[PDB]
Amino acid sequence: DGAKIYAQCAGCHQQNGQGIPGAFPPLAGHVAEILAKEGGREYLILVLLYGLQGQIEVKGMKYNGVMSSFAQLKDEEIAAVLNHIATAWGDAKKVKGFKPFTAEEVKKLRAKKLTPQQVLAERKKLGLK
Ligand code: HEM
């Protein structure tokens, strides 16, 4: 399930999803912020498929690291971990009528390979600083 896949994330983003200041952004309380944006859910898929780099802001704090791609995970595994990060800490409550992630959303986005630099560009397209 989603919780089991999340073990591959917890070393950085932590068991409680709160991250580590300066090093690894929080997911708890922050996934809702991303989901609130038009293109937010697609963006979360792109991070897992293609990784991320560059300076970003989360809860007013700056991060300047690199996340690897997790494209070795199957479409259903990516859908599962994304549902875990959306629900484990109540981020999906804040979002009106949240539909769970599904394999076909990941499949669709696997069809157009991006670089981590392009993923950052996508994040900025959301209105996120
Ligand atoms: C499948 C497991 C993982 C998931 C679901 C996950 C989730 C995410 C998400 C959703 C973001 C975007 C946050 C934002 O744009 O505000 C992100 C960024 C980031 N993640 Fe992960 N992550 C995972 C594994 C890891 C691991 C293992 C590491 C450590 C090696 C890591 C380090 C980072 C870093 C450093 C960033 C920010 C990149 C930057 O500063 O530009 N992640 N992660």
From Swiss-Prot:
Domain of life assignment: Bacteria
InterPro entries cross-referenced by the UniProt entry: Cyt_c-like_dom, Cyt_c-like_dom_sf, Cytochrome_c-type_DH
Keyword Heme recorded: yes
Post-translational modifications: Binds 1 heme c group covalently per subunit.
Keyword annotations of the record: Electron transport, Heme, Iron, Metal-binding, Transport
PROSITE patterns in the record: CYTC
Record carries keyword Electron transport: yes
UniProt function note: This monoheme basic protein appears to function as an electron donor to cytochrome oxidase in T.thermophilus.
Protein name per the record: Cytochrome c-552
Organism: Thermus thermophilus
